[PDB]
Design a protein around this ligand. Structure first.
Ligand SMILES: [Cl-]
Ligand SMILES: [Cl-]
Lengths: 32, 31, 33
């Protein structure tokens, strides 16, 4: 059960890093 | 304590998923 | 082990929060005005 939660936590981390990088990429595309 | 942690993980996933969808929408606003 | 995982989850929540704020900024950048 703790192992199952650890997998879910590492997946959430993957997802957040990916969203962070997608935001950064879009900012680079548009500019102020 | 473990069920509190499981609830927090579920909430984090819900918030990540919302952010994902917001990013997708903003991409299409530029795209 | 559980304490360590709690700490990781708190860090993920921080990262989610920072991402929320960056998304809000992007919304202003790509919206009309
Ligand atoms: Cl998490
Ligand atoms: Cl996120």
């Amino acid at each position: 059960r703790m192992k199952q939660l650890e997998d879910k936590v590492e997946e959430n981390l993957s997802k957040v890093y990916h969203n962070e990088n997608e935001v950064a990429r879009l900012k680079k595309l548009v500019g102020e």
